[PDB]
Amino acid sequence: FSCNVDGGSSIGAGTTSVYVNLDPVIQPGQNLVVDLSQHISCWNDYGGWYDTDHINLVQGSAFAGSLQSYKGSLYWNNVTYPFPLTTNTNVLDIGDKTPMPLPLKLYITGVVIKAGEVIARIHMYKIATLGSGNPRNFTWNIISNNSVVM
């Protein structure tokens, strides 16, 4: 099982930065959408649904540092969860070698967000089908490319 970010080199586990464009200006009523399907894709390393991968997001996934006070929602694979995540999400099954963009969106409710700032840490868990399933942990550190004001 492997993923990449913005079509980059393969990732089998660990923490990776994911850079996103955010609305440069917001008013207190406005909530920011962060469509992570535009950046993260994963695939089965055999294809053919032979040793199928099972992926979910993990309890404890949350906003980072400054935004710990923020509220939001996390859309994952047909369900919209409160964010930060207080439970593990449903499982997405990955069996094709053709990359699947992750069905993952984050909704977030002067300068409030800095470019280069980690705004959320999303923990993802993988376990396959054969043997022990060779479980792996991924963390996606979501970082804004730009300032967001007000």
79: number of Cβ within 10 Å: 10
- Cβ proximity to ligand BQY, 128 vs 143, nearer residue: 128
- Cβ proximity to ligand BQY, 46 vs 107, nearer residue: 46
Tokens of 5: 């970010």
CB of 102: closest distance to ligand BQY in angstroms? 15
Q: Is 2 in the site for ligand BQY (CB under 6 A)?
A: yes
Cα–Cα dist 85/93, whole Å: 20
> What is the total count of residues that contact ligand BQY (CB under 6 A)?
10
Q: Which residue has the tokens 């950046």?
A: 39
Q: Is 134 in the site for ligand BQY (CB under 6 A)?
A: yes
Question: Backbone phi, then psi, for 66, in 5-degree steps?
Answer: -60, -35
Binders of ligand BQY among 9-68, rule CB under 6 A? 12, 44-46, 51, 53
What's CA 105's distance to the chain center, in Å?
7
- Interacting residues of 132 by C-beta distance below 8 A, sequence separation 6+: none
Q: Is 1 in the site for ligand BQY (CB under 6 A)?
A: yes
- Cβ proximity to ligand BQY, 49 vs 150, nearer residue: 49
Binders of ligand BQY among 74-133, rule CB under 6 A? 128
What does R_g of the chain's alpha carbons equal in angstroms?
16
Binding stretches for ligand BQY (CB under 6 A)? 1-2, 12, 44-46, 51, 53, 128, 134
